[PDB]
Amino acid sequence: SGAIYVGNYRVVNRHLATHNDWANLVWEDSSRDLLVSSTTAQGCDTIARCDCQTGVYYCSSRRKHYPVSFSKPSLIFVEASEYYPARYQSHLMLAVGHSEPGDCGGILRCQHGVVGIVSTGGNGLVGFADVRDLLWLDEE
Ligand SMILES: Cn1ncc(-c2cc(Cl)cc(Cl)c2)c1CC(=O)N1CCC[C@H](C(N)=O)C1
Ligand SMILES: [Zn+2]
Numbered sequence: 001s002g003a004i005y006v007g008n009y010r011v012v013n014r015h016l017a018t019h020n021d022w023a024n025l026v027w028e029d030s031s032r033d034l035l036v037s038s039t040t041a042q043g044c045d046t047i048a049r050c051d052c053q054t055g056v057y058y059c060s061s062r063r064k065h066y067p068v069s070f071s072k073p074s075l076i077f078v079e080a081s082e083y084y085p086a087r088y089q090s091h092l093m094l095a096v097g098h099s100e101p102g103d104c105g106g107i108l109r110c111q112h113g114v115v116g117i118v119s120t121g122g123n124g125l126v127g128f129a130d131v132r133d134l135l136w137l138d139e140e
Contacts, residue, residue, distance in 0.1 A: 002058070002105025004114050005043025006137050011036050013104045013119055013129070015083035031090045033119045033129050036137070047137050048112035055115055057126065058106035059098055068095035070108070073130040078120050091130045092120065099126035 004011040012021060014028055014035040021037040028035040053072065056065050070093040080086040081101075093108075099121025106118040108128045120127030131137065 001060070001102070002107065002117060004045050004047075004107065004117060004131065005039065006045045006047055006114070007139075008039050008042060009036050009137055010039050010043070011117065011131060011137070013117060016104060030084070031088070032092075033084075033089060034131070036134075045107075046113040047134070048110050048115045048132055049135075049138075050110065050112040050132065052110035052112065052115065055108050055110040057095075057097065057108040057118065057128065059118075059126075060103050060106055061100040062098060066097050068097050068108075068126070070095040070128060073133070076120075076127070078127075079122075089120065089127075089129075091133070093128045093130055094120075095126050095128070096124060097126040098124065 017035040024037045026036040056067050073091045075088050075090050076092045078089045103118050108115045116128040116130045119129040
């Protein structure tokens with residue numbers, strides 16, 4: 001589990017969105033596994049606006065933050081799960097690192113701010129849904 005709290009927005013994995021998230025919906029995209037809902041309180045996270053390929057992510061199944069090198073956001077084939085059929089997920093970055101089901105939502109960050117959240121994993125790989133291109137998260 002986990003979310004990014006930037007301005008009056010809450011960014012979560014779409015597959016983990018609550019009824020309150022859907023009832024206060026700002027934007028969602030199944031192909032990216034992302035959903036953004038509105039919040040009453042202002043958040044403290046800042047979004048990175050950069051092309052960093054190195055950062056640190058939070059792994060809840062180890063209570064640890066790990067430094068990683070990650071690929072550029074791309075279209076990648078993801079196997080079937082209880083949440084989606086096997087399909088291509090867009091804006092996904094891969095890295096070598098531990099991840100289990102339950103680790104989705106962990107933040108990946110670089111020197112500039114939040115880069116994205118854990119969305120996929122398996123056998124020593126971890127995949128992050130990028131949010132750096134969502135410029136509108138910084139305003140309104
Ligand atoms: C986060 N994580 N880390 C490891 C595994 C994983 C490991 C094993 Cl052994 C078996 C399975 Cl089915 C999954 C997962 C879960 C995962 O990748 N997904 C399930 C939730 C929706 C995700 C999506 N974005 O499509 C895909
Ligand atoms: Zn950066």
